[PDB]
Amino acid sequence: ETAAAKFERQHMDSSTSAASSSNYCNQMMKSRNLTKDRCKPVNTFVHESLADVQAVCSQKNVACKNGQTNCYQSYSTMSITDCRETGSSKYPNCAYKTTQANKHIIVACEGNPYVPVHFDASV
């Protein structure tokens, strides 16, 4: 999987405008194969077109949590869903708490074309 394709599979959900119900995370973490060998503890889904998320790589340049400087903050807020494993969750029965919000996103970009390859944070 290329780095760009793995970001789309783990974080893009342009088919919905927002998380619907409290089971959204349990369903999406499973269908995007993030519960496959372990339960990915934290993951964010972005409800905007791929083009709008790719445009973030040309917006506000900021440092990544790791100190690298190829991170970019979106100028506007975007609809996002934060999925966090519950203290109860245990592989293979992964359980997640769903939180829907509109926030700025921060992504790490790379390559040519320069597109998102990691989701750093939401603010």
Description:
The structure is a monomer. The protein is an alpha+beta fold and 123 residues long. It has a single domain, classed as P-30 Protein, CATH 3.10.130.10. The chain contains 3 helices and 7 strands; from the N terminus they run ααβαββββββ. It has helices at residues 3-11, 24-31, 50-54; strands at residues 42-46, 60-62, 71-73, 78-85, 96-103, 105-110, 115-122. It has a 4-stranded antiparallel beta sheet with strand order 2-3-6-7. Strands 1-4-5 form a 3-stranded antiparallel beta sheet, with helices on one face. The longest helix is centred in the N-terminal third of the chain and has 9 residues, at 3-11. 30% of the residues are buried. It catalyses: an [RNA] containing cytidine + H2O = an [RNA]-3'-cytidine-3'-phosphate + a 5'-hydroxy-ribonucleotide-3'-[RNA]; an [RNA] containing uridine + H2O = an [RNA]-3'-uridine-3'-phosphate + a 5'-hydroxy-ribonucleotide-3'-[RNA]. The active site is at residues 11, 118.
